[PDB]
Amino acid sequence: AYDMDGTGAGSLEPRGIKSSAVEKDSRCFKVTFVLPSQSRLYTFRELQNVYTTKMVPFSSWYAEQQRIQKMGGKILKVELVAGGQMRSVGNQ
Amino acid sequence: AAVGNKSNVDAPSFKGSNMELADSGADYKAFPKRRMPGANMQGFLDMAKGMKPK
Amino acid sequence: MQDAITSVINAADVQGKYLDANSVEKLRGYFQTGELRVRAAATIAANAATIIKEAVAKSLLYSDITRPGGNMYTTRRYAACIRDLDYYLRYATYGMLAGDPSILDERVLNGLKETYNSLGVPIGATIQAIQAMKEVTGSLVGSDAGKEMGLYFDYICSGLS
Amino acid sequence: MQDAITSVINAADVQGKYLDANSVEKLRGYFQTGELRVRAAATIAANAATIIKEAVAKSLLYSDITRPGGNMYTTRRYAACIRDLDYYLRYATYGMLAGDPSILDERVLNGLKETYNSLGVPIGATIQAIQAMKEVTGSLVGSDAGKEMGLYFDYICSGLS
Amino acid sequence: SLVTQVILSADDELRYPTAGELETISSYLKTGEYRIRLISILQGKEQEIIRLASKKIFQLHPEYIAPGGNASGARQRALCLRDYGWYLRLITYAILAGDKEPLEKIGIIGVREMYNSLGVPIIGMIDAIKCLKEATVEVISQEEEDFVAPYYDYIIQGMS
Amino acid sequence: SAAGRDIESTGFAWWSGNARLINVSGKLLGAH
Amino acid sequence: SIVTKSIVNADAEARYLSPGELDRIKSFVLSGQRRLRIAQTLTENRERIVKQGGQQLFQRRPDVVSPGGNAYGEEMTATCLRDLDYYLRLVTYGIIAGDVTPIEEIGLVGVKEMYSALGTPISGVAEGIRCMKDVACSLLSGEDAAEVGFYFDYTLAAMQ
Amino acid sequence: SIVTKSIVNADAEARYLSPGELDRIKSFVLSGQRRLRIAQTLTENRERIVKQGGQQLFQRRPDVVSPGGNAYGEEMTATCLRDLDYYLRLVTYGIIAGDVTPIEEIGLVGVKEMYSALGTPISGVAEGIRCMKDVACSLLSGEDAAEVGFYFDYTLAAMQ
Amino acid sequence: VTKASGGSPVVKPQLYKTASMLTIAQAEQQDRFLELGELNQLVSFLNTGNIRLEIADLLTKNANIIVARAADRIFVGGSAISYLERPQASIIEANSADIASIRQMTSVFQGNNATPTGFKPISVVRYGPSRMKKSLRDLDWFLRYLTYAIVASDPNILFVNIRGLREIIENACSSAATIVALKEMKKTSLSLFPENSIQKEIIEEYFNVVVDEFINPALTDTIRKRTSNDLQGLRLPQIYAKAGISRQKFVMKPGLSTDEKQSVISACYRQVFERDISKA
Amino acid sequence: MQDIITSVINQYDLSGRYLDIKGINQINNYFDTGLKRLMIAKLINKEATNLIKEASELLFIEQPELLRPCGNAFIGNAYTTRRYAACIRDIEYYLRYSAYSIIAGNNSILDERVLDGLKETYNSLLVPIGPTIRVIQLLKEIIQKKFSTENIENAIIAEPFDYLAINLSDKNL
Numbered sequence A: 001a002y003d004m005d006g007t008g009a010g011s012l013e014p015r016g017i018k019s020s021a022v023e024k025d026s027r028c029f030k031v032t033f034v035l036p037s038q039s040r041l042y043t044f045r046e047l048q049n050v051y052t053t054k055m056v057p058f059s060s061w062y063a064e065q066q067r068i069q070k071m072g073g074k075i076l077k078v079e080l081v082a083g084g085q086m087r088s089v090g091n092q
Numbered sequence B: 001a002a003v004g005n006k007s008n009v010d011a012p013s014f015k016g017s018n019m020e021l022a023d024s025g026a027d028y029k030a031f032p033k034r035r036m037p038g039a040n041m042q043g044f045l046d047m048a049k050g051m052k053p054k
Numbered sequence C, D: 001m002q003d004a005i006t007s008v009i010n011a012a013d014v015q016g017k018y019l020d021a022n023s024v025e026k027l028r029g030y031f032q033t034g035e036l037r038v039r040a041a042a043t044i045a046a047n048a049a050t051i052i053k054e055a056v057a058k059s060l061l062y063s064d065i066t067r068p069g070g071n072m073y074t075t076r077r078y079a080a081c082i083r084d085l086d087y088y089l090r091y092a093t094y095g096m097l098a099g100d101p102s103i104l105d106e107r108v109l110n111g112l113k114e115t116y117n118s119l120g121v122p123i124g125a126t127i128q129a130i131q132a133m134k135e136v137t138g139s140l141v142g143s144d145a146g147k148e149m150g151l152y153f154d155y156i157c158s159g160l161s
Numbered sequence E: 001s002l003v004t005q006v007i008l009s010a011d012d013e014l015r016y017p018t019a020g021e022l023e024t025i026s027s028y029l030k031t032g033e034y035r036i037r038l039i040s041i042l043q044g045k046e047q048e049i050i051r052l053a054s055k056k057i058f059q060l061h062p063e064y065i066a067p068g069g070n071a072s073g074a075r076q077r078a079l080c081l082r083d084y085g086w087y088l089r090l091i092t093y094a095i096l097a098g099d100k101e102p103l104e105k106i107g108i109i110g111v112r113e114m115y116n117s118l119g120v121p122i123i124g125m126i127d128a129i130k131c132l133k134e135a136t137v138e139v140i141s142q143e144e145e146d147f148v149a150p151y152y153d154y155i156i157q158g159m160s
Numbered sequence F: 001s002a003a004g005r006d007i008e009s010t011g012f013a014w015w016s017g018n019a020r021l022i023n024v025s026g027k028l029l030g031a032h
Numbered sequence G, H: 001s002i003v004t005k006s007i008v009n010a011d012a013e014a015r016y017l018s019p020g021e022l023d024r025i026k027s028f029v030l031s032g033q034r035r036l037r038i039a040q041t042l043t044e045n046r047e048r049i050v051k052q053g054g055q056q057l058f059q060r061r062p063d064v065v066s067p068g069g070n071a072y073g074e075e076m077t078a079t080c081l082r083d084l085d086y087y088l089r090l091v092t093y094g095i096i097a098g099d100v101t102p103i104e105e106i107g108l109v110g111v112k113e114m115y116s117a118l119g120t121p122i123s124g125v126a127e128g129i130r131c132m133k134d135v136a137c138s139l140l141s142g143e144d145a146a147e148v149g150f151y152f153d154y155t156l157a158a159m160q
Numbered sequence I: 001v002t003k004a005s006g007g008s009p010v011v012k013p014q015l016y017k018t019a020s021m022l023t024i025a026q027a028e029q030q031d032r033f034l035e036l037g038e039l040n041q042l043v044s045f046l047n048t049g050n051i052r053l054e055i056a057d058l059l060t061k062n063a064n065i066i067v068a069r070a071a072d073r074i075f076v077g078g079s080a081i082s083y084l085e086r087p088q089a090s091i092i093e094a095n096s097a098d099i100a101s102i103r104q105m106t107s108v109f110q111g112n113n114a115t116p117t118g119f120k121p122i123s124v125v126r127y128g129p130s131r132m133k134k135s136l137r138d139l140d141w142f143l144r145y146l147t148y149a150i151v152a153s154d155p156n157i158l159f160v161n162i163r164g165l166r167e168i169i170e171n172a173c174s175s176a177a178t179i180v181a182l183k184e185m186k187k188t189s190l191s192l193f194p195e196n197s198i199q200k201e202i203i204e205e206y207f208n209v210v211v212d213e214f215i216n217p218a219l220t221d222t223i224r225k226r227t228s229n230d231l232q233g234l235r236l237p238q239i240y241a242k243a244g245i246s247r248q249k250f251v252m253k254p255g256l257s258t259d260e261k262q263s264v265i266s267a268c269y270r271q272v273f274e275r276d277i278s279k280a
Numbered sequence J: 001m002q003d004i005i006t007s008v009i010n011q012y013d014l015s016g017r018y019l020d021i022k023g024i025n026q027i028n029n030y031f032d033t034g035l036k037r038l039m040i041a042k043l044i045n046k047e048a049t050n051l052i053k054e055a056s057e058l059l060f061i062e063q064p065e066l067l068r069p070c071g072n073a074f075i076g077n078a079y080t081t082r083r084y085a086a087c088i089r090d091i092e093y094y095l096r097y098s099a100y101s102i103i104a105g106n107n108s109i110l111d112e113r114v115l116d117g118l119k120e121t122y123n124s125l126l127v128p129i130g131p132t133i134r135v136i137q138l139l140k141e142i143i144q145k146k147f148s149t150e151n152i153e154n155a156i157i158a159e160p161f162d163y164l165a166i167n168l169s170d171k172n173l
């Protein structure tokens, strides 16, 4: 279901990205960032634009924001376009 | 021309040689008919000349 | 995935020899039919939906595979057929241009009869659909071009059998 | 992504009218230069590595962007340049064939100057590299063909500025 | 450096450094000054060594020095010693931060396409570094040159 | 391939720049 | 056109254009003189190609014009011929572009959604284009009728 | 070898190895010094043992090399001696293994199917191995010639 | 010993492209019949056809003359062309082309300039036979894939086998003793055709693709570094991936034409669902 | 993978017992030769690009067929330079994973990362298994040329290369 079942350290599925997203979450951000690949010079793949602006969901913004810095990216701006704040029920 | 003239006996076919022209050699199989002596094998060919004449 | 030129170059290369008179003799034979194959592949591209509509209505339209219980009953299952028959008429067009059926078994034939047995698709009705589809394809492209396009249909039917 | 024929058809279509004498008048002008553009794109494909090697050695090879601290110091950063200059010489070749610079801003110009500012890439040295690359390209393809290929280089330099 | 590899390598698993990794930081920091003492030995012999590198890279490869080769001319040979100076400077970085990243984030990653766009034969540069390692053995005793030996041949492995 | 037509390709300067033909036997034959 | 999608094909593949792609851009531009003559024939024959186009369309599909048909009355019949003037125009674009790319993104992409949402029988408009094809190919020689008819039947295929 | 089939014998019988089996593994390994000397003699005498082996083979069987024979010409005669180099090699394996188990599953099992399927007279290749045997036993003393010849005649027996 | 097995399906690795070939594959990968542009693609290279083929036989017939005239230039020591060995596979035959070199038992000069400056030509007696057993074999092969590139569509088969080639043989070969030999074949092969006719420009353009790219630095090895522990890093020569049809990608730059934005989206359907269900 | 140590500890865990002295004697034999296992590894990094080059010429000098046309058997030997480029690449791997496996003192890294599917992969491409194994031991003799005056480094160097040889064989006996 959601990503906070009871998993933490020392648990059977591997220790990973745990987001505070509810059941079928409907909140999503509008993020903007550059993310240079830092791996094209030994792979020699084709090049793709690294400056992107896209709507990521609340269910997986934290994983994406945690990963964009993994590969040296810089986050220029993020906002919560869709969803409420301090909302107990209704994020579903 | 057939030249079927007469006295077509059967026994005693003899010897000699002629090697008549091929045909149909105008077809097209993609593989050869295979033959030997690659490299890993130049040693023994040069070396079967030795006994070739015996 | 080899055409007639790729297959000729491979056999001439696999013996390490140049393109002798016999290798170029077949290549000249392929270039002579190069004009016929494009016009054959031209009209087949135009009448792709019409050919498949003619084959299914002529072979397996009203048989009891079409009725309930038959192998083609539900609309998802019927729609999979004309999707499925489109590949046979399409890949056969590729073999007709390349002049070599290597693309068929590379991308169609392998794991095909083993897949229809899994789904339970009737191989008997499948080949007759392709045979009927081969019959209408000889209508459009003519006789000799139909002989060329027809030469790869039964190649599918043979291996799919 | 429109060529000269696509742009002519679009403007003639966007008013809902047929291809009158003025629309075909430009199309005939494009077909006249069709022979020049292919030979221009022919030699540029051959001397792609030689042109980029000539531009960097003539514009920014020994400047202090090349030395430590400069924007091009490390081997990853140097290797990104000739990778980066390859697109400018390549996409400019596409604009020279299509006869319309729509492909450049569609696939090169948009988010480009906004990207170099993020990385901190010097736009000043970049344009002079493309200007020097434009200078050697006029050497190969000739004068008028260089005028054509050169017409899309400064289009990149203008928008990248 | 080495601590950076442990912080990074422990960070993609979302965990603190384990028992073995904290050894790898602790043992690295206890051998600290000996890298510091060693790099000052090499910095005082950079004019020592690159003069000896130009000995054998060119007697081995007179193709490059001759008229027509890339290194023909004064100013081409002038930077020629500069590339030795940057490489030797990079190795002092690698000898200090006890790993290969300063030899890899600089110098190694994409070096072939740099030289290939320059005309320098990439095989010749491999012998240049091999020449440079051959030159460092003379001005260095047996104790500490096998400490610096594995940092050289990584560059040769990186360039192939 | 080609060799020895400079100061720091052989060691000899230009006033000695007739003695870059000692280990170069082909140019020396055309010199004689 | 053939020029723009032979580019975007080789664009996606990270490569330049092969001889197979550049000997056809070459072969297409030398074909350009003959294409403008063919499109010039259909350009000022739209009065007959459309009006005789709707001629056979109503004789073959009297339902669409009969009371209850979608094109019933003085009003809809005028728009009934308006669409044929559209599709006859797009065929002139496809002949000059050497491809149905102009016809693709105009009048073909999502055409079934429009005509289904207008209440028009999409099979009926397909019958209209076929009637225009016999009038168009009757205006040209055999070498041309294999082209002008060739673009109509593609429109027939995508319109059902 | 004697070690592996003395095991698989006692393996099948659900038992360990008797003194009759373990006093011969013992007796074989003390024999191992003398076996390597014997195989060492045949190892670098293959030039004479094979070439003189095919010497007597053609003098005794001129049919196989005459025109029409299987080993006719420069080509087949080279392969004609190649097989003798094979079988001379397997005898060196049997001497070191102390058994024809290496010769059994290599060059003996199903050998008649190969040579019958190659058109080669299997009796002719048997004559070749006998000619090699007289050359081999002429290179060793009487105590050794009772072994090196001993493995050839087993190959002669299975090859007919 | 390995205690399991995934099986080995028959796989034919890519070798080269041809003009008859890749355009059949491009529309193949997009799941469509080729269109009239690409049908116009497949036709007039077939319409090249016999022109490509006759270039082979005229080039193939005097193959020894093409190879021998290079031998006179850069090989001291008499003829030194005995080490040729045309059948390179040791087969009896199936059929053979005709070459028929020297008949009775460098003739006229009048323009013959091979070495640009003081280049040392290889000797032969000092160069030794075993190394000599390749140099005529490779002067052979440069005649070969050219006469496979003419008969095929493109020069791509030359590009794959000549990119890193000069580096690999750079230690047992003076490289400039190849560029002289490769520019002797075009000078010899241009003796055959009336120049400023169509065939003269065809084969000339294929010679300078192999000789100018011969003097060109080899591609760098591509590396596949893995992300986590249990994987293993690999390494492939960049030669290896540029042989064959070379499968395409699709990108969604907003602002494309809505077809190429439609061909990319439907390309996304086939990837994730394995069959374009919107078409199906 | 598993080194000599972890392989030893799993040996005692399966039985669920602590490490006795026979277990520790196996670990001590690694710790003694562990310092000797490194300059074997350090020599390989210094001799890596060379040792592949001597292996190739020593291979093709005995297998000239590998540099020739394949015959109609579409077989992958070093025919073309595309074939030759990738074929030298395999000698990279056999020297590499046999270099780690010298340091681990155990062939656990070998079979799971080299042997598993090796006959699978070569049977697909029709690659020579015979010459492929012979080049593996041309490297072994070439590496043992350096450490030859004594003979306790020799058994260390032989263990990885000998393991690939016995395992890539279709078993004749």
Ligand code: CLA
Residues within 6 Å of the ligand: F014, F015, F016, F017, F018, F019
């Ligand atoms: C067959 C005779 C012969 C030969 C082959 C050589 C060969 C050589 N000598 Mg040597 N030498 C010779 C005789 C010879 N020498 C004699 C007779 C003397 C005594 C004077 C010397 C003294 C000598 C010295 C001191 C040196 C050499 C050097 C050299 C080397 C380079 C030469 C050079 O660059 O000069 C280039 C030429 C000049 C710079 C021009 C000099 C012009 C002189 C000063 C004027 C000549 C006057 C003449 C009689 C009339 C001229 C008419 C006038 C109107 C112009 C070369 C191997 C050098 C060396 O060791 O290299 C390894 C060196 O340093 N030589």
Ligand SMILES: CCC1=C(C)/C(=C/C2=NC(=C\c3[nH]c(/C=C4\NC(=O)[C@H](C)[C@H]4CC)c(C)c3CCC(=O)O)/C(CCC(=O)O)=C2C)NC1=O
Residues within 6 Å of the ligand: A018, A019, A020, A021, A058, A061, A062, A065, A066, A085, A086
């Ligand atoms: C590694 C650097 C880094 C940080 C720090 C980070 C923070 C971060 N904090 C979040 C939420 C949150 N953070 C808090 C925290 C707090 N509430 C309080 O009253 C306190 C003041 C505070 C605890 C100290 C809460 C309650 C949420 C949930 C908000 C919601 O459901 O709307 C979220 C939204 C997604 C998710 O949690 O799955 C992110 C991405 N991400 C990063 O990559």
Ligand SMILES: CCC1=C(C)/C(=C/C2=NC(=C\c3[nH]c(/C=C4\NC(=O)[C@H](C)[C@H]4CC)c(C)c3CCC(=O)O)/C(CCC(=O)O)=C2C)NC1=O
Residues within 6 Å of the ligand: C065, C071, C072, C076, C077, C078, C080, C081, C082, C084, C085, C087, C107, C108, C109, C112, C115, C119, C121, C122, C123, C125, C126, C129, I275
């Ligand atoms: C390109 C080579 C190639 C082929 C040919 C191919 C066939 C293929 N046919 C399928 C199904 C099917 N195929 C049929 C076909 C038929 N029913 C009949 O009665 C007729 C005899 C026949 C039409 C001629 C049907 C009904 C299904 C659906 C089966 C089901 O839902 O269980 C499926 C299952 C998945 C899907 O359709 O999405 C595959 C993968 N895949 C390939 O990659």
Ligand SMILES: CCC1=C(C)/C(=C/C2=NC(=C\c3[nH]c(/C=C4\NC(=O)[C@H](C)[C@H]4CC)c(C)c3CCC(=O)O)/C(CCC(=O)O)=C2C)NC1=O
Residues within 6 Å of the ligand: A036, A037, A038, A040, A047, A048, A049, A050, D065, D071, D072, D076, D077, D078, D080, D081, D082, D084, D085, D087, D107, D108, D109, D112, D115, D119, D121, D122, D123, D125, D126, D129
């Ligand atoms: C097809 C249109 C297009 C372009 C042009 C493009 C550019 C682009 N240039 C980049 C970097 C770069 N570009 C340069 C370029 C230069 N340094 C200089 O001094 C010069 C002025 C200049 C060479 C002319 C350098 C050094 C980097 C690396 C920056 C870094 O590592 O921080 C990057 C970061 C990622 C990467 O290279 O893998 C992108 C995405 N992307 C595109 O899609």
Ligand SMILES: CCC1=C(C)/C(=C/C2=NC(=C\c3[nH]c(/C=C4\NC(=O)[C@H](C)[C@H]4CC)c(C)c3CCC(=O)O)/C(CCC(=O)O)=C2C)NC1=O
Residues within 6 Å of the ligand: D057, D061, D062, D066, D067, D073, D074, D075, E057, E064, E065, E070, E071, E072, E076, E077, E079, E080, E081, E083, E084, E086, E087, E106, E107, E118, E119, E120, E124, E125, E128
């Ligand atoms: C920190 C890592 C690093 C390196 C190594 C580097 C190298 C580098 N070498 C260059 C040129 C050059 N390099 C050489 C080099 C040589 N000739 C020989 O015979 C030798 C074997 C070799 C020197 C030891 C030559 C001849 C040129 C000039 C080529 C030309 O412009 O014609 C250039 C062009 C500008 C310049 O000289 O500064 C760069 C950037 N940049 C870097 O950031």
Ligand SMILES: CCC1=C(C)/C(=C/C2=NC(=C\c3[nH]c(/C=C4\NC(=O)[C@H](C)[C@H]4CC)c(C)c3CCC(=O)O)/C(CCC(=O)O)=C2C)NC1=O
Residues within 6 Å of the ligand: G064, G065, G069, G070, G071, G072, G076, G077, G079, G080, G081, G083, G084, G086, G087, G106, G107, G108, G118, G120, G121, G124, G125, G128
């Ligand atoms: C360039 C591609 C293109 C097409 C094809 C197109 C069609 C189109 N057809 C329309 C109406 C119409 N179209 C018809 C057509 C027909 N009635 C029949 O019986 C026949 C079967 C058929 C014609 C042969 C009728 C009757 C209407 C009016 C429907 C109404 O008033 O409700 C309308 C709404 C009115 C208008 O704006 O014209 C559009 C937009 N637009 C385009 O951009």
Ligand SMILES: CCC1=C(C)/C(=C/C2=NC(=C\c3[nH]c(/C=C4\NC(=O)[C@H](C)[C@H]4CC)c(C)c3CCC(=O)O)/C(CCC(=O)O)=C2C)NC1=O
Residues within 6 Å of the ligand: H064, H065, H069, H070, H071, H072, H076, H077, H079, H080, H081, H083, H084, H086, H087, H106, H107, H108, H118, H120, H121, H124, H125, H128
């Ligand atoms: C290790 C056990 C072993 C043996 C013995 C063996 C034999 C063997 N003998 C062969 C051929 C041959 N063998 C002969 C042999 C002979 N001609 C004569 O006249 C003589 C009687 C006789 C030799 C003394 C000839 C002529 C051929 C070539 C036949 C042909 O080309 O059709 C071939 C096919 C070519 C090849 O791959 O070498 C095999 C495999 N393989 C094995 O693994």
Ligand SMILES: CCC1=C(C)/C(=C/C2=NC(=C\c3[nH]c(/C=C4\NC(=O)[C@H](C)[C@H]4CC)c(C)c3CCC(=O)O)/C(CCC(=O)O)=C2C)NC1=O
Residues within 6 Å of the ligand: I131, I132, I134, I135, I136, I138, I139, I141, I142, I144, I145, I161, I162, I165, I168, I169, I172, I173, I174, I177, I178, I181, J067, J079, J080, J081, J082, J084
């Ligand atoms: C069809 C395109 C094509 C070519 C040409 C090719 C060449 C090729 N030449 C090779 C070697 C060689 N090639 C040559 C010689 C020469 N080579 C020349 O192009 C010159 C004419 C001559 C020097 C003047 C020599 C001497 C060797 C042996 C080098 C060595 O021992 O490593 C090798 C390594 C295997 C071998 O020993 O033959 C290849 C794969 N491969 C290809 O796919």
Ligand SMILES: CCC1=C(C)/C(=C/C2=NC(=C\c3[nH]c(/C=C4\NC(=O)[C@H](C)[C@H]4CC)c(C)c3CCC(=O)O)/C(CCC(=O)O)=C2C)NC1=O
Residues within 6 Å of the ligand: I013, I014, I236, J066, J075, J076, J077, J078, J079, J082, J083, J084, J086, J087, J088, J090, J091, J093, J094, J097, J113, J114, J121, J125, J127, J128, J129, J131, J132, J135
């Ligand atoms: C880590 C362990 C490991 C190995 C060894 C390995 C091998 C491997 N060898 C390959 C090909 C190949 N390997 C060779 C090798 C040879 N040809 C000969 O004639 C010689 C016997 C031999 C050189 C010794 C050739 C020619 C190919 C290409 C086959 C072809 O495309 O024709 C390929 C397919 C290309 C690719 O790498 O993607 C793989 C995966 N992969 C692994 O993960």
